[PDB]
Every structure is written in C-alpha cells, then in structure tokens.
Amino acid sequence: GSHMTLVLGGIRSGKSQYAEQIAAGFGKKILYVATAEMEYRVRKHQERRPKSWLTLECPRHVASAVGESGLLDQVDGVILECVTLLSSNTLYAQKDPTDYEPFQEALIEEIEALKKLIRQSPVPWVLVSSETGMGISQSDAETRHYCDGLGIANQLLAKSADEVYFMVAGLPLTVKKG
Amino acid sequence: GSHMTLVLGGIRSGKSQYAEQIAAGFGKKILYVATAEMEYRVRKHQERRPKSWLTLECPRHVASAVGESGLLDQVDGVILECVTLLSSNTLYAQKDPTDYEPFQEALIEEIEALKKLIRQSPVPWVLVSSETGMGISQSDAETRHYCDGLGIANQLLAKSADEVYFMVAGLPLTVKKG
Amino acid sequence: GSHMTLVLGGIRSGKSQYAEQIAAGFGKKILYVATAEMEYRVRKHQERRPKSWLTLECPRHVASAVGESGLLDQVDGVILECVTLLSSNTLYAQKDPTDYEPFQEALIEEIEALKKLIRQSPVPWVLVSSETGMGISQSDAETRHYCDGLGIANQLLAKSADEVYFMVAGLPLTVKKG
Numbered sequence A, B, C: 001g002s003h004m005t006l007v008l009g010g011i012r013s014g015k016s017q018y019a020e021q022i023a024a025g026f027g028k029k030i031l032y033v034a035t036a037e038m039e040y041r042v043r044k045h046q047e048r049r050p051k052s053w054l055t056l057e058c059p060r061h062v063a064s065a066v067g068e069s070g071l072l073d074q075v076d077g078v079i080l081e082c083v084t085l086l087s088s089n090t091l092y093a094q095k096d097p098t099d100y101e102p103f104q105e106a107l108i109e110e111i112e113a114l115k116k117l118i119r120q121s122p123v124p125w126v127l128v129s130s131e132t133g134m135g136i137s138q139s140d141a142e143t144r145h146y147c148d149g150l151g152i153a154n155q156l157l158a159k160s161a162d163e164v165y166f167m168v169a170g171l172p173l174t175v176k177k178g
Helices: A015-026 A060-071 A085-094 A101-119 A143-162 B015-026 B062-069 B083-092 B101-119 B141-160 C015-026 C064-067 C083-092 C101-119 C141-160
Strands: A002-010 A031-034 A052-056 A079-081 A127-128 A163-168 A170-174 B005-008 B030-034 B054-057 B077-081 B124-128 B163-168 B171-176 C004-009 C030-034 C054-057 C077-081 C123-131 C161-166 C171-176
Touching: A002 A015, A002 A031, A002 A143, A015 A031, A015 A079, A015 A127, A015 A163, A031 A060, A052 A060, A079 B124, A085 A101, A085 A127, A085 A143, A101 A143, A127 A143, A127 A163, A127 B077, A127 C101, A170 B171, A170 C171, B005 B015, B015 B030, B015 B077, B015 B124, B015 B163, B030 B062, B054 B062, B062 B101, B077 C015, B083 B101, B083 B124, B083 B141, B124 B141, B171 C171, C004 C015, C015 C030, C015 C077, C015 C161, C030 C064, C054 C064, C083 C101, C083 C123, C083 C141, C101 C123, C123 C141
Parallel strands: A002 A127, A002 A163, A031 A052, A031 A079, A079 A127, B005 B124, B005 B163, B030 B054, B030 B077, B077 B124, C004 C123, C004 C161, C030 C054, C030 C077, C077 C123
Antiparallel strands: A163 A170, B163 B171, C161 C171
16 A cells, blocks of 8 residues: 555566455545557457546646646546557657657656656555566567667666566566565 | 476576476486477477477467376376467467457466366476566557467466566576475 | 575675675685676776775686686685676677587687586685676577576586576565575
C-alpha cells in the first residue's frame, strides 16, 4: 500500500494485470490514465476493466491533463498505462526522430512533471512501463534513442517510486519496497 | 523438490545446466523430452547427458507423445527441453506465420495439454524456456507474434508450476517457491 | 565488501553508477580500467569520475596490461568498464566476425586471464557488463555470435565473482552474495 508503484516488464510479462490488481487494491473507483494514440475514429478492442473505473485519454502532457481534469479528487487511485506509449508519442512528435536531444529533453520534462504531480497527489499511483534494454543492440538510430530514453524514464520513476516490481512470466520480483 | 519447475532465461543464461541439475535431483533415470526438429538424417552434436537418461524426441504434440509412450512409469522425473523450440515448431507449421490467431491458439492448446499431463503425472517435471520479451520491439510481424506467443506460454507455465526460476549469467533468481 | 563484484544490466540500467558507488566503497584511489576503443585522436566526452581515480585505457588483453602496469599496488580497488566493449573489441579484431570459434576462444582466454588476475589481486574488483540475451533472436550471425560470447563471459565472471548484481531501472537485484 505505497504511494507510488512502478511495475515494469517485457512483452507479455503480465505487468498490466498485476498493476491492475495493485490499483484495485487502491479502491473501487480508479482513474485509468491511458496514454495511447478527421471526422471519425476507429478503435481496437479495449481491455475489460471494472465498471466504476473512469478512463482518461491523454497521449501527451500527462501530468498537465490529469491535474487540469481535477479527477484526482473523485477517485481512490491512479493506474498509468503506460510509460512505454508515452515515450513513443514523445518520440514520434519531434521533427527529426533520428535526433536524440529534443526527444530526450521532452521526455524528461514529461517524467519530471509526472513525479511532481504524484508527489502532490492525494491518491496513490501505480505506473506501467516496459523493459526494452536487455536485448541485442539494435541498429536503427531512432530505435536506439527510444530505448535509451525509455530506460532513463524508468530510472527516474523507479527512484521516485516507493515500490518497484519487475515482472517475469506474470510473476513479480520485488526490486524495491519500503 | 516441487512437482513442477519452470526454469527460464535468456541466451547463454545457463538455464539448461540448472534445469539439468534439478532433474538430476529428481533421480537417476530421467526422461529428457527434446522438442527439437527423406532417407537419412544429419545431426548436430548432442549435449553429454547422463547414461541412465532416456531421450524422447517429439517436436509437436508433446503431451500426447509423452503420455502415449508410457515412459512416465519407468523414470524418476522429466526435463522438457524446451518450450522455446516447441513454440518455434508450432509457428513454422502454420500456413501463414505472419498471421497470429492460429499459431496462438495451437500453442495454447499445446501448453494446456502439457499442464494437464504434468498435473496427472506420477513424476515431477522441470521445463526449460527462454525469455525473449525484454528487447527492442522487433519489426517483423512473424517475429513479434512468436515473441508474444512464447511469453503467453511462459505465463501459463509459471502459473501452473510450483517453482519458477529466472536465470541471470548462470545464477538463479527465485521468482516463485512453495 | 567482497573481493570480486559483477554488476550487469541492460541499456540505461544504471549499472555504471552502481558499480562506481561500489568502487568508491573500495577507497579513495580507484583504478578505472576502460576497455573502450594516425596523428591525432578525437574523444567523446568522458564521465565525471573522481579526481583521485587513475584511468587505465586498455581495449584488449586487459589482464596483461593491468598486471604489467603494476598499478594494482598503488590503488585501493578496481572498476572494470566494461566487459561489453571488451567482447566487442575481441570480435571486431578477428579476420571473419561471422565465424564463431576464434572469437569465442579469444574471449574465453581474455576472461580466464581476468579471473586469474583478480584471484591474485591485492585489491578488490567491481566489473561492469551488459545483459543482451533476453531479446528477440537477432538474424545477423555476427550479432548472434557476439550475444552468445558476451553471455558466456558473463557466466564465467558471475561464477568467479563473490557478489553479482542485476540492474533493473537503476536498482539492484542481488543474484549472489557471500
């Protein structure tokens, strides 16, 4: 029952289900902050999440949107899904994604804003992120930069978080617990 | 000394040696179930495994073959080498490997059959699998699908298993122990 | 405060900072052994490491160079940065990098020499290496061989080391501690 929880893991590691159980532990009304991406919209099938949960779609400037919504004052907890897509959205919105500096600085501004919000938050947070740095060194410069930036974001979040879990095949290894 | 053991790890993580030590802990006669792939056969050099061990070659429908062999009634334990190649064989045998649904469902049927067999087994099992989901997101659709399917299989097996070990540089981290 | 420490992790895992803290724990004068690669030299900005630390540049035959320098008799501890670049230098110096055997044997000779030196060393060692085997199976033969060789080196070092740490998002998981 910590204030800030980071759950990270690889592809099909069960990180979403575990973070969702932590968030259900927060309470019955949960803010599911979804960072996913003219006239109409087509949507891929959404996960079957609880009925009392409210969903906040914000692909960029997550801390700003969540703070402006005021919804932190009507829920019991926050699940952020996920740091991975937030990094992806920050990269694909730069002018040159093969350049590292602007994307890195923008993602760091984003993560620092999230740390500020969570520290000042009345409800607890569980955040979902991916581990992508333990593979072969990819060749693409855009891809290497993305991997580096996500990893930096994960370091910053793990340091600010009270509990940090690393998922292997659906089961959590405790990295940090108060 | 649990009933079902899952040992997973990356490339050159020592998972095979550690699973083989667990299996040697099972007893002296071990069933080594090998899931590897016109007139003749050429073979790559096999690992030097104990003399009393019996080797069962079955690249697909592993639970069916092991059950039909009856060999669970003549050995002290089973080492399954490995879930990785079983997923690979299930993928490369579909009509279209760039399609996800058939491969996913076939691999899930395979893993569910293995869970059933192990639950009904008189001897214990140690299973070897790979962790492949902590790298950069690969581009190939066949490859992404394979990675997703292996990870799902690893979740199902870890949940059914009594002990789960994650290998780093030859040494085990305990993920789950009864 | 062990004799031989191995810190490994992925891209942007904080392994360098953590190994540097262990080394600062060794004492005030530390040998930073850097394995990085006609008339002049251009250099990328170096990390801001302590003033009393001495830096030894040796991209290949690390044990030989460190032993010949005699510097193990003027410092309080050694940080080796890093096994990853040492493997890379050993691979790129072979005639055919798509061939596995020569590179593998040369890297094993290198790691065995390092194990010998550390065992015979008056000061303790912390070594930095990368985990690269938990991603999708790469296609390139040179790349697959490199990944296999680094993983073998990490096994040998982890076995000889007294303490082994695996880094996730800047935080260490203890793999082995005396």
